[PDB]
Subunit: 332 residues, 4 copies
């Protein structure tokens, strides 16, 4: 399928990387009004976190050509004006973070796009997480959400656990890497005052709707989960810390077996499993949504356990945006 | 009380600094075979995390002289050889990290000290946390532990919540600043392999008995709490994240009211309370054991809640070592 | 003299702190459209780099009240509309970074300000560095510039060395702490593409006019100096590295004596001297413009030498802004 | 040539990585008394800076097996007791950092090694830098040094500039990533007090003989260069800042040409050249010795210039150790 990307930010660039590495979808257009063609060459070629792109990146005849694939570049502030149908962009990845409602994201449909995948949570577009509920997608849905990086880490683990032992209730913390929303030194962030404080100097508490959101993609968990976040001074890779009460008793070793089995089966490539003595850098550019860390977690008793799973918040998620698009395309 | 300090390290120097700031005890001797006298001046005078010493420090005739007060200096590798009695040191702060059993810490009694305070959890020495069980200290105890920074944070909050609502069970996470046992780049770390990984690059999961230890200072909570830690790239200030089940129902506002009331009363100076939009740097050089963060926590229902409390792992703990020694001296 | 601040940022806030230590400067008004009154209370009170404010700060009756002094708060995007005259602001500190020319900074005069001090280099306003050319100010100048942090570090040193030995030519590197113009993760940065790359992850080369600008405040050095910068992952405190050819011969010991003699006499408070084994954090909240590090520099021979001088880019500069106002006020 | 590695650390491990990209060097033995066999598997497989090993690693029958090649593991503190001859190690890489003189590194010969390559400057073993003086090696030299990362960055650039324009005199600064010698928080470093201060909190000045050593590899530059370093909070990748006086005049674009020409011909893969808007992370895992940053440097005039070159201090140098062994083996 032919894909257009709106917003060549971290997620837009890394979706693009993922699409080219993988060969699965064809990027044919990109819109970004704040980043010109020659700057796009540079921002895609060099990446502080994931390294230099492999292959050619160049500007040719007002296009962005990556390994000889020419991509049409737009610079529209208003998504309605973007000529997606003319450029052959069938599916649009909406990655600006500012067009996340059905209302706003549907503006791509005017331009000729057939479907829009919001690379972020939505107030009202239906949400999907690969391995958890992506089967609920159907042909009538033109605007969908891939949820958040954190919900994509948590939901597959919650699913495995709930399925075998039943989650009565659960409280989540994510210790999350620095994001573009943050500031280098104490500066203004109007509404969210903690998020203005110097990012590399602080542990910063933040609220997050990721845990509640799991209750939408796994409806049996509706109301059973919530949580919060701490932003910490790393550039990428984050971790979920799920403290849950279980209905059926489970020895920790039973939890390990059942997660490892899910990682080898229906959730392969989505949920991983490790017993190694890992740290966050070992998940740099790792494509899983969630990788359970058997050694880091801890049980108080057979009904009350803390479970730990890692996620490359940029790269895991980006690959899932690609995989959702592949599924949607198979269902046309 | 006249105090000797074994080990001039983060904690050894900050205990010294807290003693000089507060005036609560008199430091009369320091032993550290790896820092010569002129190096001691330098290490005490300049501090990256807490700033220059406010006062004077110099070497004079073989003594370290702080604020004009001369301190006898020893250079002994074996604590059994430290002539504490010649210096007049009555209590000895055992702050090396390598003599934490009663048998090992008891060597200070051979050179003339009367009591020893181990500035770390001990496998076997009686453990005390100011504001929680310090009143159980008595004059028969010559060798005691002030527990860990993390225990000193968790225990006062745990006491308040258990006292009011009953903790049925809890799991703790501590998001913890980097420590001197870590490494700058990936290198060897004995049996704790994760701990050798480059400290400033990684979120590093770690074991801690600090939650279990709360059952030593609050026996009713024996077997009801455990936890783990994550080491992240900040130089100082850590946070406890406690997920607990309560016996009685408690609305989040009643929880706040009761913590705030404990902070103003018998735990004043130990347990703090804030509703401000704080981040970790706001507690740098803060002397509390634990500061409840009202806006950071979240409740799922009236019996399942996540409570957040901050702690200056260096300077809050150092001040508690000083406070315990004042309390001990009041019982002689 | 009564002062207004436009732009309540790192420099706006730190100028306000510094001013609360002088009888000669009173802050009476502040304008910042991205920080409402209750937000200012918070941004002023809490500071990741310099710690909590030691006086009182409150919002009371629509005013910002600091150490009992009520400050009028404005919220204008266009400095032409700010009613400084009404609030009694005679001098205005122009610290937004976006009005650095005479035309733009001159807007403040429409509202009744008498003089404007731009807290950055200006293309056309006369530039002053305290201890170097501040006596060239006269009371007909309504718009002036306090130059940059880097210029304020380099000029006093350059002056001492030129005055004693003559500098034939010099090339400067500054290794500079992260700032507000940088980005947390790889992001859009207009024409300065290097400045967009994640600030915590990188050493980032950057151009700086600061060494050239020394040829304005020391006209004999005109065209004899230039330089560049590297941005590095520290939150505050920067260092100048001056490699210069000297006209007369100077042994390194003579350079030291000469610099120290200046630090004790005419440039006391502006130019410091140390022989201690210092590192950047040792200058955090340090009010000097420049402190020569005697142990860090190195000479190739008597005419070719690398000289090293530290500067708290936030607080040293913020104190010079106050000091230039005090000097200007003395000339009224 | 079959090679053994003494000290399996950043350089030991990355040499080993680089050896496994070379059909001309076979690692057959590793000694490291602080890393047992199973820990070596972990330490080799996972790398925070350079990512997971792209190959296989396991322990089998007492040996470390990398990409199917079995390597004998020794656990000796005293290098004279290591049985290199018996394991078949002809060359030994001496990468502990504690055996750098001819006499100390000589110890490997007693256990049957034929030649020793010291991965660090030596007081008396002959120093080589690939592309500058490696052709001065001959088979009578059983103990050699590959100089330092910083010398390998500066010397190739200095050669090009000196050969074309002549360097009358030069002063170097290197802005260098953190290394294993540093500390995570302020701690003891008795010979080098600045180096004990918390590494991720500070810019730390440090002495370096690397500029002076360029005079041993380029005897015509003897006494004409010296320099110093700052250590800053990045995990890897460093930069040289060369301030030099030229005999013949050279416009900056003539400098660019000569350097670029050198990079395409005889110093290819050693000296790189870029005009891109690069920052440190763009050289992470880059195998060059020195990459000239055209945009970053600046000239005062035709005879006085500041030149910028980047280097991955870990990975470039490690590749050079391997390249030096290849060269030496070519002469046997
Ligand atoms: N830093 C914290 O956040 C913190 C908090 C609570 C408790 N603690 C505990 O405090 C203790 C010390 O911690 P630290 O962070 O100060 O470590 P540190 O590494 O900074 O200090 C240890 C000091 O002991 C010295 N030393 C080593 N061997 C010695 C010997 N045989 N005799 C005398 N001195 C010796 C070293 O030279 C060093 O100055 C540990 O038990 C640790 O668990 C630390
Ligand atoms: N931080 C340093 O190290 C340093 C040192 C010397 C000089 N300076 C200079 O001082 C100036 C400020 O730097 P900073 O580091 O405080 O930046 P900063 O981003 O912290 O502060 C900028 C402030 O100006 C405000 N602002 C933006 N537009 C405005 C407008 N139209 N009206 C009123 N306020 C507005 C912002 O809300 C912000 O609070 C710059 O010119 C900078 O070059 C900075
Ligand atoms: N890291 C760099 O950027 C860099 C660049 C160029 C050269 N070097 C040089 O290479 C050497 C090692 O540097 P590194 O950064 O890899 O340090 P490192 O601390 O990572 O490695 C040293 C290793 O030697 C081992 N070791 C200690 N004593 C030993 C003994 N007696 N026998 C065998 N092994 C022993 C340690 O366990 C460790 O694994 C030093 O000379 C250093 O100056 C380092």
């Amino acid at each position: 399928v032919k894909v257009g990307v709106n917003g060549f930010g971290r997620i837009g660039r890394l979706v693009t990387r993922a699409a080219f590495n993988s060969g699965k979808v064809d990027i044919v257009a990109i819109n970004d009004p704040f980043i010109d063609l020659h700057y796009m060459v540079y921002m895609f070629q060099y990446d502080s976190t994931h390294g230099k792109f492999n292959g050619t990146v160049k500007a040719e005849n007002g296009k962005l050509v990556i390994n000889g694939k020419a991509i049409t570049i737009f610079q529209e502030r208003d998504p309605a004006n973007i000529k997606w149908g003319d450029a052959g962009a069938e599916y649009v990845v909406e990655s600006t973070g500012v067009f996340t409602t059905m209302e706003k994201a549907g503006a791509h449909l005017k331009g000729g796009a057939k479907r829009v995948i919001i690379s972020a949570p939505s107030a009202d577009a239906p949400m999907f997480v690969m391995g958890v509920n992506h089967e609920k997608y159907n042909n009538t849905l033109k605007i969908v959400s891939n949820a958040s990086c954190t919900t994509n880490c948590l939901a597959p683990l919650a699913k495995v656990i709930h399925d075998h032992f039943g989650i009565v209730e659960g409280l989540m913390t994510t210790v999350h890497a620095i994001t573009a929303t943050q500031k280098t030194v104490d500066g203004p962030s109007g509404k969210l005052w903690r998020d203005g404080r110097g990012a590399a100097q602080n542990i910063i508490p933040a609220s997050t709707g990721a845990a509640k959101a799991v209750g939408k993609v796994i409806p049996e968990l509706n109301g059973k989960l919530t949580g919060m976040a701490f932003r910490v001074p790393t550039p990428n890779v984050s971790v979920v810390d799920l403290t849950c009460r279980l209905e059926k008793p489970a020895k920790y070793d039973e939890i390990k077996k059942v997660v490892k089995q899910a990682s080898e089966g229906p959730l392969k490539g989505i949920l991983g499993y490790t017993e190694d003595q890992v740290v966050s850098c070992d998940f740099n550019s790792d494509t899983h949504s969630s990788t359970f860390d058997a050694g880091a977690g801890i049980a108080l008793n057979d009904h009350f356990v803390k479970l730990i799973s890692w996620y490359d918040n940029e790269f895991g998620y980006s690959n899932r945006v690609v995989d959702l698009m592949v599924h949607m395309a198979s269902k046309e």
